[PDB]
């Protein structure tokens, strides 16, 4: 399944934490889609913040990288995992 099309846009904190937790584990977007039994399409859209983020799929993605995907506590680990940095957003 074709995906891509990245050329300077914003990324929601979900999309950032997705990418960051992926890359922390070398997991491609297609590896992620596999881990959550989804399309690699929606992962590529989640990264920008252009899919609809639903707590069901967000919950699967938490398992995927071992970090939280809601709250300003996003990128905190689930139970056990390494530290990560934080930062603001805008809108």
């Amino acid at each position: 399944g074709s995906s891509g099309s990245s050329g300077d846009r914003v990324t929601l904190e979900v999309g950032k934490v997705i990418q960051q937790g992926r890359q922390s584990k070398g997991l491609t977007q297609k590896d992620l889609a596999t881990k959550i039994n989804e399309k690699p399409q929606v992962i590529a859209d989640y990264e920008s913040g252009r899919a609809i983020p639903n707590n069901q799929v967000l919950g699967k993605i938490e398992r995927a990288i071992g970090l939280k995907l809601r709250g300003k506590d996003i990128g905190k680990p689930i139970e056990k995992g390494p530290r990560a940095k934080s930062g603001p957003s805008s809108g």
Side-chain angles (χ1 to χ4, degrees), residues 39-57:
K39 296 285 186 204
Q41 196 69 61
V42 302
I43 307 302
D45 280 3
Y46 252 99
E47 257 185 41
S48 312
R50 291 227 297 279
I52 304 302
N54 207 20
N55 65 292
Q56 190 163 270
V57 181

Side-chain angles (χ1 to χ4, degrees), residues 2-21:
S2 209
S3 42
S5 311
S6 39
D8 276 5
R9 72 306 194 89
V10 181
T11 57
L12 265 57
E13 51 265 76
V14 165
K16 184 77 75 162
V17 174
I18 284 160
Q19 195 181 45
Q20 283 202 324

Side-chain angles (χ1 to χ4, degrees), residues 32-45:
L32 219 298
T34 304
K35 251 203 197 298
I36 71 161
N37 304 64
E38 288 295 328
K39 296 285 186 204
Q41 196 69 61
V42 302
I43 307 302
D45 280 3

